Paper text:
HLA-B*57:01, HLA-B*57:03 and HLA-B*58:01 are micropolymorphic HLA allotypes of the HLA-B17 serotype. Polymorphism within these allotypes is focussed on regions of the antigen-binding cleft (cleft polymorphisms in comparison to HLA-B*57:01: Asp114Asn and Ser116Tyr in HLA-B*57:03, and Met45Thr, Ala46Glu, Val97Arg and Val103Leu in HLA-B*58:01). Notably, residues 97, 114 and 116 contribute to the E pocket of the antigen-binding cleft, whilst residue 116 also contributes to the F pocket.
To do so we chose two 9mers containing Arg/Lys at P7 (PΩ-2) that formed a natural part of the HLA-B*57:01 peptide repertoire, LSSPVTKSF and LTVQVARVY, and designed P7/9 variants, to utilise in thermal stability experiments. In contrast, the substitution of the P9Tyr for Trp, which is more enriched at this location in ligands of both allotypes, improved the stability of both HLA-B*57:01 (+2.8 °C) and HLA-B*57:03 (+8.6 °C) complexes. Instead, due to the reduced E pocket volume caused by the Ser116Tyr substitution, these residues deviated by 9.7 Å and pointed out of the groove. Structural analysis of bound peptide conformation showed a pronounced change in orientation of PΩ-2 Arg/Lys conferred by the Ser116Tyr polymorphism of HLA-B*57:03 that would markedly change the surface presented to T cells.
Author numbering:
A (entry chain B): 1 to 97
B (entry chain A): 1 to 276
C (entry chain C): 1 to 9
The structure:
């Protein structure tokens, strides 16, 4: 009946401190389609994140890309936080350059 | 090479929260080009790729009318499926549909597709002959008997061999700068010790299109399939995709490992190693 | 271009 999301957090281009980039959180493999995804900058939710139009794979499971412009620095920590019916509590995956 | 057009519809009920949401997206290969979302402030078929933008108002208006009509039909099918599965009206359920056509380099139809799911499981599928159906269970056999009585497969076959192929050929021409360009992967290998006697080697592919790619690790010339961690291919957001494959190897044996990359954008497969 | 047949179950 239900399938839990796979989550990857990564950048559009290889990261260089002080250079504009995009931070991505790709959630995939999940069913049903309702999902809650936040991007976090130092534990705090980033506003106005955009996401792709809902689509699905050959095995019917859904995927979405959430993304926002960002400028990596040495200090700042980034993460993706995902909730879904299959999850007891939000799962947080940290960005690792 | 060969190319495909696919549309994907999802219809999600939400009792107590209004009528079911209907979303449709269309793709040529791995490039999305249209979307429709019944929950938008003003639902219409909207462009998502630059080469579709040149279609005129008759196209956008027709596609919008068709998506509204389809959304009404799929809302009805969700009611129907509830009865077919003896389910209560309290729950939320999902219908998904995918259909479309695949053409070879000369533009001739290679094969057509029309397949339906209910709650993420197969429900009914048009077979490759485009003339018979495979139903996944007794509920879907009720639909099968109705579609057989109405000769639905004949109408789909006519779309799949006709308009589907014709419109895909048109999109391929209008988008030829991108839909007909493969970008090969930029590849490299990274090395990170995990302990004094093991290290991870990770072979990266970035910036490639289309999404299909094969990344394999060999040790002494033999594939390390059972031992390789492969992440799902993921979208960069600028049309291209990324992937990596990793293997854990004994310290001092790194040079026995080679990463092999196959992609449509490469003239020949690539072999790379960790270069300290 | 999408298909016009949307069929009832």
């Amino acid at each position: 009946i239900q399938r839990t999301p796979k989550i990857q957090v990564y950048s559009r281009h290889p990261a260089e401190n002080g250079k504009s980039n995009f931070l991505n959180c790709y959630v995939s493999g999940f069913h049903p389609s309702d999902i809650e995804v936040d991007l976090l900058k130092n534990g705090e939710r980033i506003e106005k994140v955009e996401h792709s139009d809902l689509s699905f794979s050959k095995d019917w499971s859904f995927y979405l890309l959430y993304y926002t412009e960002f400028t990596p620095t040495e200090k700042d920590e980034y993460a993706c936080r995902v909730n879904h019916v299959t999850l007891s509590q939000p799962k947080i995956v940290k960005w690792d350059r | 090479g060969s190319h495909s057009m696919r549309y994907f519809y999802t219809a999600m009920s939400r009792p107590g929260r209004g009528e079911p949401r209907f979303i449709a997206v269309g793709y040529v290969d791995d490039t999305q080009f249209v979307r429709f979302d019944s929950d938008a402030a003003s639902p219409r078929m909207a462009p998502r790729a630059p080469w579709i933008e040149q279609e005129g108002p008759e196209y956008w208006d027709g596609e919008t009318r068709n998506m509204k009509a389809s959304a009404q039909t799929y809302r009805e099918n969700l009611r129907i499926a509830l009865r077919y599965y003896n389910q209560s009206e309290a729950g939320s359920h999902i219908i998904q549909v995918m259909y479309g056509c695949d053409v070879g380099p000369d533009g001739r139809l290679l094969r057509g597709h029309n397949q339906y799911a209910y709650d993420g499981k197969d429900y009914i599928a048009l077979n490759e002959d485009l003339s018979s159906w495979t139903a996944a269970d007794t509920a879907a056999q009720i639909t099968q008997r109705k579609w057989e009585a109405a000769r639905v497969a004949e109408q789909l076959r006519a779309y799949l061999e006709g308009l589907c192929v014709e419109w895909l050929r048109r999109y391929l021409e209008n988008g030829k700068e991108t839909l007909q360009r493969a970008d090969p992967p930029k590849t490299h290998v990274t090395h990170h010790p995990i302990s004094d006697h093991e290290a991870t080697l990770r072979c990266w592919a970035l910036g490639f299109y289309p999404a299909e790619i094969t990344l394999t690790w060999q040790r002494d010339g033999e594939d390390q399939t059972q031992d390789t961690e492969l992440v799902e291919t993921r979208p960069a957001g600028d049309r291209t995709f990324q992937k990596w494959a990793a293997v854990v190897v004994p310290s001092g044996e790194e040079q026995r490992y080679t990463c092999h990359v196959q992609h449509e954008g490469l003239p020949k497969p690539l072999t790379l190693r960790w270069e300290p | 271009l999408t298909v016009q047949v949307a069929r009832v179950y």
